Design a protein around this ligand. Structure first.
Ligand code: HEC
Ligand code: HEC
Ligand code: HEC
Ligand SMILES: [Ca+2]
Ligand SMILES: [Ca+2]
Ligand SMILES: [Ca+2]
Ligand SMILES: [Ca+2]
Ligand SMILES: [Cl-]
Ligand SMILES: [Cl-]
Ligand SMILES: [Cl-]
Ligand SMILES: [Cl-]
Ligand SMILES: [Mn+2]
Lengths: 106, 106, 106
């Protein structure tokens, strides 16, 4: 899907994790985030439309989602062993990676 | 940033507000809107390129962003109080200011 | 193409028209606008996903692209007969149809 759609998937499930009840809600929301972050790697963001497709900015953009997907996965590990509160805290820390990419390319 | 990017920022965050679930998002989206409104005030829109830079039309254009910035601020205050629906109602009334300027200078 | 992609096409080519220097560039810009308008007619905009597929709002949306396509046609005519200044002038009144649909459905 489109880049804005994948971002809405990231944003909406991050809030689900904030409010979540049990590990299953967290784990399901985190798996949807990981799919969206990988799908986002296929996109060219408007601010980099004019750059060459393998420019250092475009590489920085794409690897930002590898970084995000791995941090998502670390939080999902906490949830799958049942450390729901720690999973939620790890998910809140994802905002730093979100915000780092945004201040460059959003 | 260019007028066009500022307008994308305004439209994109308005849509984020319309779908938002908590006050924190609405607040952060409104703050990005206020930045882009003030930055857009520096631009000369294509329709007014051949008029004096201090023409009544250019003053009207620039004051429209003061108005938009203050209206955004009113909605931000509702979001800061946690009143999600009220801040969403106020953000939706922003369209009247968006529309009014477009009718003249789009 | 999805709705937003066709909108970017409409917007980019209207800007090309505003600053064109030959009737062949205009002619080319208008027909990519026509294709994007007709392709956009196939979409359901997010704010009307809640209405029936042939609701009065969905009809109003689709027929808006017919009115767009016919105004684009009038512009392409003026351009094909060398009036160029009148073509750009016709492309400028396109904007009222852009604005009208956005005010209801964006
Ligand atoms: C780069 C590596 C990014 C990472 C990591 C995240 N986001 Fe993002 N985001 C990015 C861009 C380039 C854009 C602009 C897209 C456009 O076409 O305008 C965005 C946008 C958003 C949005 C707005 C979506 C919309 O409908 O307009 C949201 C709500 C958003 N981003 C949230 C978000 C979250 C919660 C992230 C981490 C969990 C995250 N993003 C990561 C670039 C990047
Ligand atoms: C004048 C005082 C304006 C106000 C208030 C708002 N907008 Fe605007 N907009 C204005 C102009 C002169 C233009 C054309 C220049 C341009 O950027 O193309 C626009 C255009 C837009 C667009 C498309 C622009 C693009 O991407 O190139 C959008 C999506 C848009 N405007 C949205 C928008 C919203 C949601 C507003 C209120 C929150 C708003 N604009 C206010 C002038 C003015
Ligand atoms: C209805 C009949 C429309 C007409 C005619 C035009 N547009 Fe449009 N546009 C429409 C909708 C419902 C939407 C929202 C789509 C969404 O998924 O949110 C849009 C959006 C745009 C945008 C994108 C703004 C953004 O996402 O940042 C642009 C730049 C835009 N529209 C421009 C545009 C122009 C230049 C038009 C006339 C030539 C025009 N639109 C007509 C619906 C309709
Ligand atoms: Ca979108
Ligand atoms: Ca965008
Ligand atoms: Ca958008
Ligand atoms: Ca798209
Ligand atoms: Cl001044
Ligand atoms: Cl001033
Ligand atoms: Cl504010
Ligand atoms: Cl809008
Ligand atoms: Mn105040």
């Amino acid at each position: 899907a489109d880049l804005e759609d994948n971002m809405e998937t990231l944003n909406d499930n991050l809030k689900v994790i904030e409010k979540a009840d049990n590990a299953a809600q967290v784990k399901d929301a985190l798996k949807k985030m990981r799919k969206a972050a990988l799908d986002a790697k296929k996109a060219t963001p408007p601010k980099l439309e004019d750059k060459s497709p393998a420019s250092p900015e475009m590489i920085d953009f794409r690897v930002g989602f590898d970084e995000l997907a791995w941090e998502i996965h670390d939080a999902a590990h906490l949830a799958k062993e049942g450390k729901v509160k720690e999973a939620q805290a790890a998910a809140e820390q994802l905002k730093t990676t979100c915000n780092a990419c945004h201040q460059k390319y959003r």
